[PDB]
Amino acid sequence: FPGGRVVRLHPVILASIVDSYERRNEGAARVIGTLLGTVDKHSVEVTNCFSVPHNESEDEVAVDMEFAKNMYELHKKVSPNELILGWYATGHDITEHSVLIHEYYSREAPNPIHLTVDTSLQNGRMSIKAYVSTSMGVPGRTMGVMFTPLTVKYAYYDTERIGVDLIMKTCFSPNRVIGLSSDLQQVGGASARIQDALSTVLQYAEDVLSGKVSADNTVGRFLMSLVNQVPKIVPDDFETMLNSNINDLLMVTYLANLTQSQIALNEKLVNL
Amino acid sequence: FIDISEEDQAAELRAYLKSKGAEISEENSEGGLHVDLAQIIEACDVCLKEDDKDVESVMNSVVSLLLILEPDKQEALIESLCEKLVKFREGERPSLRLQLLSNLFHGMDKNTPVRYTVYCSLIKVAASCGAIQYIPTELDQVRKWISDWNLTTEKKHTLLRLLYEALVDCKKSDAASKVMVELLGSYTEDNASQARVDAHRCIVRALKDPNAFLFDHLLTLKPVKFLEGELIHDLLTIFVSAKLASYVKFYQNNKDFIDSLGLLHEQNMAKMRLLTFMGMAVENKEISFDTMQQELQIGADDVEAFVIDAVRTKMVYCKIDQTQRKVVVSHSTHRTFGKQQWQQLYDTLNAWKQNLNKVKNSLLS
Amino acid sequence: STAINLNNPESQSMHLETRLVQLDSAISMELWQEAFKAVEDIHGLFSLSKKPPKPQLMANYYNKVSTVFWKSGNALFHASTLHRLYHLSREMRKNLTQDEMQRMSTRVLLATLSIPITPERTDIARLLDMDGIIVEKQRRLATLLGLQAPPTRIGLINDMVRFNVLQYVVPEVKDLYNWLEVEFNPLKLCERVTKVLNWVREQPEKEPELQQYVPQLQSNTILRLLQQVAQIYQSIEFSRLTSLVPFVDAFQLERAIVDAARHCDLQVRIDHTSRTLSFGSDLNYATREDAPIGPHLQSMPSEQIRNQLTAMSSVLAKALEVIKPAHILQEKEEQHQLAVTAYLKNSRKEHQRILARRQTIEERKERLESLNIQREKEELEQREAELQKVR
Amino acid sequence: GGSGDSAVKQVQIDGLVVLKIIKHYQEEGQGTEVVQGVLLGLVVEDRLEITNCFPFPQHTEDDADFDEVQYQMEMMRSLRHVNIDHLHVGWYQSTYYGSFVTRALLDSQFSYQHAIEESVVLIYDPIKTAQGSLSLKAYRL
16 A cells, blocks of 8 residues: 555644644634654654744745754654654645645655645634645646545654643533542542443433343443443452551552651751 | 646646656547537546556546546546556556545545445555554544435445455454444344355354454354244354263254364364363353363363463463462453343442442542 | 874774783683773773764674673673674674674574563662762773663564564564563463573573573573462462472472562562462552563463552543443533633634734833843842942 | 833733643642743733643653753744744743742742843642632732
């Protein structure tokens, strides 16, 4: 099979695209930048990016590639992983300026990775529409534009998409940083409560008329696995060992407050 | 070749590349254009005239791929050019000609003429390589829209049949088959007779592969409940032997067909995974040293080694106490209503674990 | 004197000379510090002599060093140097050109051994004093060998077998790791490997180098087996346990298990009045059972309960059931979608105002906030010239 | 008015900042405390708002050694050209072992705070503290 077929961004990429749009960079409706990262032969790993001074005027495009040398030199020391990959911009899809920011990027001369971030309200509009030209034969005019279907994903790191999930549920509503574990606790039993809702509906499907194929051996196998995890098997030796573990954990959590107390007492006599 | 960004004149731009191609293509370039700036005439030419014997005319094919669809028929002219790909039988560069125009870009999807065409192509054209990539987005688009036109689901069934045949990997073939068989009894080719013939091959795959374990998957959802077993398919003859614990059953129930090929070794393997499970899980966790051994009618350290086989199945899985608790939890084999009633238990069971405990948790924090 | 620059003749000469002389010298009169000094000198030369591409002898010296090492240091760094020499045989091959299968065989053999040998180090001195002053030196050794960090394990083998290594490997041995790394199954492993053991342990055409690396690697396979069966079984009689494991003697092996157990690689009650063993479901759950900082075997842990297990399981394991099947979720999320559309819809209106407002912030923030930090730093002048006027 | 003492307000750290922090998450400075970037922001309603950071790398082989400021000067011009200006109102070292404000971090801070009194010093603490509480520790002198 031929080369690129998908892209794998990260929400740092969309962070750096929504950065330069909203800072402003004279972003009335268009801001362009050079995406950075690497590729693995059919996939793209776009891993961070940053814009170049652009000016997309309707028959005049300004790509100062010299700055994308500077930024690349800088970003190379920042992390060694990144490579000059292509160009990213905001909406809308294929224009005459695709043909022009082709040429400016063909001075770098690998294959290009055209990202177009449409910013429209609708859910029927994909967030970012990855593209790469085929034909692209180039001894013709400037560069043929017939773009291949690519689609987008997120992937570079875990704790940074734990970082994006932390912003997702701040977008929901803050979600400040004090009560994190307790928020993971009280949405804990909420899952078990919405489970109680759904397991009712799956039972109730059979109760009314007939149903529950839906939990005959689908959810029936999920739940046996669930109770083989949490809690464990059910002797009372378990219960006493579980208690002895809490009595240990509590004795350790206690000893942490004993040490807070003696962190205080030595800090105090010196201050006296 | 010359770029697509050269002025169009869609016919003449796509035909200036025929002049760079064959002489036959060139005299039907000149003759194609001088008659009319033309539709089907000009548009069938690269698609039927030789792209000689070397497929670097992917470039002019790409120019044909967007400029045939809209000035004339997409549905007929997409099916042209694709005969050629399967004719030459060099597939990697034809896969680019399929890749560029896969679906959801460059006009309209059309709701499965193109998705039938370009996937019918890439199974045959490419090896397994290209064929893999389309299966998620295809089965996604099948769920996003199923063809209300019957015959195109018979076609998408045919493409799943080409899929399981072009696959020679057993478990992907089982997967592509029991997706096709899943979609079979669900809708289209049901239409009894068309499905009855398939039912035999399902009994081949379910028996032949003992990782389609016995009947567990078929109890989960529809396939047995449409495809009869007390017909001379003999599908429920598995569900007979599945609970009844011996080599005796299958061998006495014979199709002399499946006895030969076949099922011979898997009769004892049946006896294993059913007696280990229906031993363990209806105790309902802990059977003894000798119980398992006299269930299975075999040795001691052999049942140690068979506990490892059951642990590599992950039908049973924990630390195993030596002379009691031979097998414990991690349940995977059928226990149809025992699993249902235990589900029916579970909402009531969960009712405290969700209210009572959260009334302490959320209160505390 | 000598006008150093591009005169590799005399250079290379003296180099190789001292090298061979130093190497053998130390590895002859039982010296070691001398060898160390020699290596340091060679490294220094390479540093100040890295201006040239690289001539022959390289491979020679590499191999020599790896060999001389082997024992002293663990077969870990030694095996690493061995793989390095193997890689050198590739470059030298493309340039050296060696049409010999036996060579490749010997190479693969040396590689293997140097690899499977030790799955963990007994840092007693460290565990005692705190604490090195004993790590940067290892880093230095790594640098010497050409590495930047510390080698790893049969990991290493994955490494130097990404190449066409499952193949050239001579099939005395091809089907011995097809047990150790590949094949399951604890209760057959020591049986299975007995024959390729007896094969390789005939030493003279298979590099006697290998067959001193073999007894440790045999114990390493036992060590691999011993770790698994703590998850396969919860107890086992010692008389059963004897028959599971083909080995020379039980009286030997129990002490090597109690050793491993004492060095906290597994937890066992192998010593016990009845002479029977108890692995135990959890008892007190600790990383003593688990081997505390590195497996040497296939991941097959049984289920155990540790802090925030039942907590975070009940969070997410129940969540998934309401995500994957559900007729209640997707409607709610399609209306969350509608509240998400609404916010971008509110946003595009605000964006059009932020296009005016934050434009006026951005441009002015370059001037004003600079002018503010100007006055912060310019105050230090006003502090200085004013106070000068006082006195 | 939650605003700080005598030159500054509070801090607000916009999510696209913290995304860029967790890109140089806890490597390039694991066992060595490395200043992983300067916090560039602006004075907003009752707070600063760190809207962008750029990372400051160093010679991290296994020890940290300060480099030419050719990086910071060129990179703070790189920010200025497409976005705002060099508006460094703090900094973030993630870095090494759940939130701890070392004597060196107090001294580097003292040089920073006296120079520009519009400042906080962040300590971005991910999963290392068992996550855990006070993931973003601010602290001005």
